[PDB]
Amino acid sequence: MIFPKQYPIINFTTAGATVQSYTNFIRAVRGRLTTGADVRHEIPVLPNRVGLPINQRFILVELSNHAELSVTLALDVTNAYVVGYRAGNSAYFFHPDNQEDAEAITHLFTDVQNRYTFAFGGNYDRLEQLAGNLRENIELGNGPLEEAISALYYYSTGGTQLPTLARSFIICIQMISEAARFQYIEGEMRTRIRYNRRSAPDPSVITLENSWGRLSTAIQESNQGAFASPIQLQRRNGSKFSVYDVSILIPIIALMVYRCAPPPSSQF
Ligand SMILES: Nc1nc(=O)c2ncc(C(=O)N[C@@H](CO)C(=O)N[C@@H](Cc3c[nH]c4ccccc34)C(=O)O)nc2[nH]1
Incomplete structure (x- = not known):
């Protein structure tokens, strides 16, 4: 038994990435975030959280590496926030903001062996404190993304220090959610x-x-x-x-x- 439907997956790799492959990725993420129901002044609006069914609440972004590693981020369609990620047999979720978000996140990565909820939220201010650096001092680009994918992938095993995991999330959020x-x-x-x-x-x-x-x-x-x-x-x-x-x-x-x-x- 596998529970009805399945959240959409969009793939991107940093290996040999180009402007065109990155543009295709971001266009695809936008297309899965919005439904076309709500466009104001020619600018699409994300779905309203109120009444949105759980089966339509997330999208998955599967990131791969020139290092041949893969991690899958889960984005909330209501705000494009990264709420957590899976690397192999572990998943990690930022501390939920409220009970309804806590329940929602039980619908993600449901057959991963090991599930963890961080004790900290995933907002930029918290992640900057953990990283020991502000966004303005964290370089972005394809090199940073490739490095961030490996840092998220090795976190399970103690390879990745918490400050490097926080900085890795800061890179991913701006290059995926903020670009969208x-x-x-x-x-x-x-x-x-x-x-x-x-x-x-x-x-x-x-x-x-x-x-x-x-x-x-x-x-x-x-x-x-x-x-x-x-x-x-x-x-x-x-x-x-x-x-x-x-x-x-x-x-x-x-x-x-x-x-x-x-x-x-x-x-x-
Ligand atoms: N994990 C994560 N994924 C994201 O896409 C993301 N994107 C942005 C921010 C971030 O701090 N944004 C600032 C500027 O908006 C903020 O004050 N966020 C607050 C307030 C807030 C919550 N949900 C929102 C949705 C839209 C606008 C603001 C908010 C927060 O995260 O607590 N954090 C993120 N963290």
């Missing part, structure tokens, strides 16, 4: 992969990561696209960039988290 959320961050990772040059994310990337929920809510609560209150982001060089409307964000944000219902007047 933001075409701008997908483009930043494509640049690092094209030239095979790792580099830490600049303030444009960090301020978008830090503002995804505020931007989703500003767009969803806007009056015909116009924000009641501007949001300040940073350009590459750190200078302030004020966002007053959804229009400037159409090339930048690919997916929003559900924040409010769309008022009458739009997907019809």
Whole structure:
């Protein structure tokens, strides 16, 4: 007996990765995260957690290595968060935020021999504390991802120190979840992969990561696209960039988290 259906799996390898293979991967992850039910100002909205059936709650991302290793991350479709991962006979899950998330995570990697829930959550602030470094000091790119896949794979066996496991999650979340959320961050990772040059994310990337929920809510609560209150982001060089409307964000944000219902007047 195997419980009805099965979450979707998207594969990516860092071995010989190119801009095109990375673009294909991120497009595929977006396609499994969204349903097409909810698009506002041309920007797709992730499924609403309220009423979402457990059989539609996750996607799997199977990462492989030039080292020939594989780990599978589980993403929550409601927010694209990595909630845990499987390496061979062990799975690890971040500490759940609430009871409903704790139950949901029992539906993942159900026949793994060994199941662990970390005592810590998987938010960036907690993972930065564990890593002993901020996102701004952690290089991203294909080399970092290849290294992170091996670090997650060896964690079971004591090969990987906790600070290196936290830094590995930080790499994976930005190169998969944040790239799915933001075409701008997908483009930043494509640049690092094209030239095979790792580099830490600049303030444009960090301020978008830090503002995804505020931007989703500003767009969803806007009056015909116009924000009641501007949001300040940073350009590459750190200078302030004020966002007053959804229009400037159409090339930048690919997916929003559900924040409010769309008022009458739009997907019809
Ligand atoms: N494991 C993990 N997978 C992710 O994709 C991820 N992506 C982003 C963050 C992160 O700290 N985000 C900041 C900026 O939004 C935050 O304050 N997160 C809070 C609040 C929050 C929870 N769920 C959300 C969904 C959307 C926006 C914000 C939130 C948190 O994780 O507790 N952490 C992640 N951790």
